[PDB]
Amino acid sequence: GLMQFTLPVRLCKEIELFHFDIGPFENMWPGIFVYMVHRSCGTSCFELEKLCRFIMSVKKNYRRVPYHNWKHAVTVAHCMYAILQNNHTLFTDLERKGLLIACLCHDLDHRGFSNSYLQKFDHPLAALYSTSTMEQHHFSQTVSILQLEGHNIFSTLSSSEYEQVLEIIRKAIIATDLALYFGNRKQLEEMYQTGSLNLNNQSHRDRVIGLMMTACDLCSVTKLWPVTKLTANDIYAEFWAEGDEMKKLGIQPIPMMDRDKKDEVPQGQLGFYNAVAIPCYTTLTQILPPTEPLLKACRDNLSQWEKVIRGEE
Ligand SMILES: Cc1ncc(C)n2nc(CCc3nc(N(C)C4CC4)nn3C)nc12
Ligand SMILES: [Mg+2]
Ligand SMILES: [Zn+2]
């Protein structure tokens, strides 16, 4: 009850920054996450014993794939923590509780393949969920783990608060389907520009939380250049494995996933930063001004990919 998690001084200071890297020591990631829940939400949000037991069941249900792993889960939750801390008063007690949990859970039991590969392989999950296949699976795995004995971290919530937080988590996780991001940002762009955007409109909040989820999920592009560059290697290791599997089904993969087009990675990153990342962090900065450091970091990393193409590294 009187038990504060603290971190060594360098982590205690740097964890507050958007560009924080959670480091290579796997055994400190749970402590880091708990530290963030305590400062974001309070020491009273969750029964510590249940939270720790929930964190370790979430960890056990992420796989040893190169990118969509437990490190990704905690990284995406840290980005959300920074957004929530820099926008203290804009979010409800339930949203603060629900979103950190949503981020930790958003890629639960990922196998390192896109919704497309599941559909072209005819994986059973593609018959159970026709769109946002993995993302409906991820939410499903979240509910399963919440229903394990000693794991219901929301037990102190009311019947209606409980349903509200599970619905925040569902929409948050669904929104990490990048196919849904483009439309969601286009609507937010217009609503902000015409001045119709209203954070008392629940459907407006939904869209804004959805954009925060895309921002957090993509935050590898907002890190110091060496973190950004080395995460890109992990991202392509999954994509190229998927490309190999596409070829095994007798299908030319998209260039993104073809390890034979390694040479084109720098140009593919430019496309990605211009089509996806920059517009994402731009719109987010408009709606939530204190998130500007994510936009600024993203533009710096774009400029580093430009330098790679020009042979200056
Ligand atoms: C950094 C990051 N974070 C999240 C995600 C989902 N991605 N996806 C990419 C791939 C981007 C991309 N690469 C290509 N290549 C290499 C084609 C051969 C030319 N095309 N495109 C669009 N990078 C990210
Ligand atoms: Mg995902
Ligand atoms: Zn993710």
Neighbours of 52 (CB within 10 A): 16
Mutate to test the pocket of ligand 1, among 110, 115, 213, 235 (most ligand atoms within 8 A of CB): 235
Answer for the pair 36, 85: CB distance below 8 angstroms, yes or no. Answer: no
Distance (Å, whole) CA 190 – CA 169: 25
Count the Cβ atoms, other than its own, within 10 Å of residue 236: 19
Method: X-ray
| Spatial distance between the Cα atoms of 293 and 180, rounded to a whole number of angstroms | 24
> What resolution in angstroms, rounded to 1 decimal?
2.3
**Do 77 and 33 form a contact (C-beta atoms < 8 A)?**
yes
What φ, ψ does residue 85 adopt, rounded to 5°? -70, -30
- Backbone angle region of 250, left / alpha / beta, with phi > 0 → left and psi within -120 to 50 → alpha: left
What are the backbone dihedrals phi and psi of residue 64, each rounded to the nearest 5 degrees, phi first? -90, 60
User: 66 with 234: CB under 8 angstroms?
Assistant: yes
Candidate of 228, 272, 280 to mutate for ligand 1, largest count of ligand atoms within 8 Å of Cβ: 272
Copy the structure tokens of residue 172: 């948050």
Q: What is the DSSP string of the chain?
A: --------HHHHHHTTSTT----S-GGGHHHHHHHHHHHHT-TTSS-HHHHHHHHHHHHHTS---SSSSHHHHHHHHHHHHHHHHTTGGGS-HHHHHHHHHHHHHTTTT--S--HHHHHHHT-HHHHH-SSSHHHHHHHHHHHHHHHSTT--TTTTS-HHHHHHHHHHHHHHHHHT-HHHHHHHHHHHHHHHHTT---TTSHHHHHHHHHHHHHHHHTGGGGS-HHHHHHHHHHHHHHHHHHHHHHHHTT-PPPGGG-GGGGGGHHHHHHHHIIIIIHHHHHHHHHHSGGGHHHHHHHHHHHHHHHHHHTT--
How far apart are the C-alpha atoms of 236 and 253, rounded to whole Å?
Answer: 13
∠ Cα 62 76 106 (to 5°):
50
| First CA to last CA distance, the chain | 52
What distance in Å separates the CA atoms of residue 152 and residue 133, rounded to the nearest whole number? 25
The residue extents of the domains of the chain are: 28-310
**Nearest residue (CA) to ligand 1, atom 3:** 218
268 CB near ligand 1 (under 6 Å): yes
Q: Which two tokens stand for residue 288?
A: 């939530």
Q: Report the catalytic residues.
A: 68
φ, ψ for residue 25, nearest 5 deg: -90, 90
Q: Which two tokens stand for residue 289?
A: 């001004």
Residue among 302, 233, 292 at smallest CA distance from 83:
292
**106 marked among binding-site residues:** yes
* CA-to-CA dists, residue 191 to 17, 36, 202, angstroms: 29, 32, 14
CB of 80 within 8 A of CB of 97? no
CATH number 1.10.1300.10 given to 28-310: yes
